[PDB]
């Protein structure tokens with residue numbers, strides 16, 4: 612089960628379809644707030660996390676998740692593309708960091724890598 | 729302890745210095761052959777793997793490592809930058825894939841992530 616957190620609706624819907632195509636169960640949410648509601652009500656094996664979100668920055672939310680001792684693999688998937696952004700994302704507790712625009716099949720391969728580990 | 733497999737000597741030496749700066753013990757080798765000798769004689773917690781190597785392609789070597797049920801995190805670090813290359817590297821068993829040219833500090837952060 613994958614949770615995708617992404618505020619662009621068109622992109623989010625396509626990401627859900629992609630995860631389902633890969634044989635995962637997938638829930639998509641558009642805010643950090645909705646993510647917290649979903650994390651409380653369901654168990655996820657991996658989280659895909661956009662950083663630019665309307666209510667709380669994804670990086671701040673990730674910090675909170677790790678402070679709550681959540682250990683799910685997190686892949687950051689974001690338009691924030693600077694070297695500083697990538698390093699801070701990883702050091703905040705992300706397991707991978709993939710910049711937009713990106714190919715769907717690379718996302719799939721990186722999710723496979725994260726999961727078999 | 730980190731093993732770095734990279735055939736460009738100037739780059740390899742700098743990578744070793746970088747790993748040591750991060751507080752790791754680090755051995756560097758320039759071929760898949762030397763890597764196999766080192767893997768037999770030492771225990772490594774992570775392997776950094778270049779693909780273009782003189783005697784055996786790094787991707788082929790990685791396939792052999794995984795077939796021998798070696799479970800060390802492997803980060804591929806390579807000039808091979810096509811989408812097919814990246815996917816192939818990951819699916820062959822790499823845990824991350826970072827294309828050249830790259831920043832040392834991103835390599836460091838990705839190695840930290842893998843070791844977590």
Ligand code: BEF
Nearest residue numbers: 661662663689690
């Ligand atoms: F909104 Be994101 F970070 F692409």
Ligand code: BEF
Nearest residue numbers: 778779780806807
């Ligand atoms: F020789 Be590599 F793949 F940069």
Ligand SMILES: [Mg+2]
Nearest residue numbers: 618661663664
């Ligand atoms: Mg966004």
Ligand SMILES: [Mg+2]
Nearest residue numbers: 735778780781
């Ligand atoms: Mg080479």
